Amino acid sequence: MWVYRLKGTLEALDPILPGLFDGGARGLWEREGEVWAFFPAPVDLPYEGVWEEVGDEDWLEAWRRDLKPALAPPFVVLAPWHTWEGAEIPLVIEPGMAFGTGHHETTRLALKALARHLRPGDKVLDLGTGSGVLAIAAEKLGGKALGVDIDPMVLPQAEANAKRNGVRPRFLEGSLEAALPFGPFDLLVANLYAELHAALAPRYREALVPGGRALLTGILKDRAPLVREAMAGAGFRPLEEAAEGEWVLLAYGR
Template sequence: MLVYHLPGTFETREAQLDLLWEAGATGLEERAGTIRVYFDDRADLAPEVSDGEWRQEADQDWLAEFKANLRPVHAGRVTIVPPWLTGEVPAGQVALIIEPGMAFGTGHHATTRMAVEALGELELSGRTVLDVGTGSGVLAIAAALLGAGHARGLDIDPITIPIAWENAEINGVPQGRVSFAEGSLGLDSDAPEPACDVLVANLYAELHDLLAGEYAVTLRPGGPLILTGILGSKLALVSEALEREGFSQLQVRQDGEWVLLTARAPQG
């Protein structure tokens, strides 16, 4: 089996993981500070991920090993688990079942976990929630399971949409309570997103900066905003963008190098 050993972890190399899938990777695994990338054949890699080492190794069932090492993730009121670990969800916890795959969002990343925790601290009963950059749908599905009247997920990558629908079906969330679509805020002025009560987005800091005005327009006055995917070194960029657009009550949580920022939409 052909394995490419890349220094780093899923967290430190998150921005480059899609480049590996695009190069033809058949699987990714993190072990002791190294990302093991499985390929059928040697591939030409982008410069951002070319600092690793190719190795020919004995065949093994990497998927079985990955499943054996995956553990439930506790995120406030929610426990995120793959389908084969549903029996390990503690009593009283909301079970969020996510099938790991190419659309990252198993809950193991700090940004996903913090966002699910923040959603669990809100009263979502009957409210509309918009998840921008939904990926595997984990945040929209979490909102629906936590009582949202309707949760909508948007993503510019069309490959994520069927995966998100599959995850919603696995969790038994009816289509009337959740929906997913290709797109983003501000890309189609002829069909703007309707106003929502809560907006959550797990994106890079630069995208939050770019979309801050759209967040203000889309959220109802005073509505909660939950932003993550932000490196601590980029926090000021996002904070200043939100303050510029009139957001208030900014609060910061940090887990390692990653930050979650909550705020309230302008009051009119």
């Protein structure tokens, strides 16, 4: 069989799904920032995804075996079965159902930015923690991390990842509101999406001490202006922007 890989979620890709089935798709799986569509053979489709031959085997196992260490200096994200000879700070993460294996651009943007902005002793909020990777990273850098997620299903994944890495961040079900009793914070890192950053911008100011920093990603490049506006409106000072592929991270201070 063949896989046709599309960037996005099922929610975003909703209008074209019928066409994939019309083209002969027998299955679909939502993966980390991608949707995989499974066909007996390739067909010419207008949707600008990528065809990959995956057949004769277990597609999941082939994907799993092909995974390599993910560099995000000063870190390297490793599956439990990887080794790494470099001097990078290892973050051992099981590539599971929760977003945050280290293989997505946004996660990597967030990890690199954390290292540039975190001061040891800093109280850190990881909003939308998923696998726990950013909270784990924050602990490695000398931060005191709290990771929260609206999906309670990610929490035992995050706890298990923390244990594997010899760190003890706090993990809790909820959103920014559930975090607020534990703040204010020195540093907020939030790999979410543009519309949600914009909506939350006022509460972000709230969540941070004076001098605090907000590191926002999960932002598509053409949706960035939306975030720049909201953050400016809440009195944030822009610090730096970083990009990878179609994604950006926007760093702010107050």
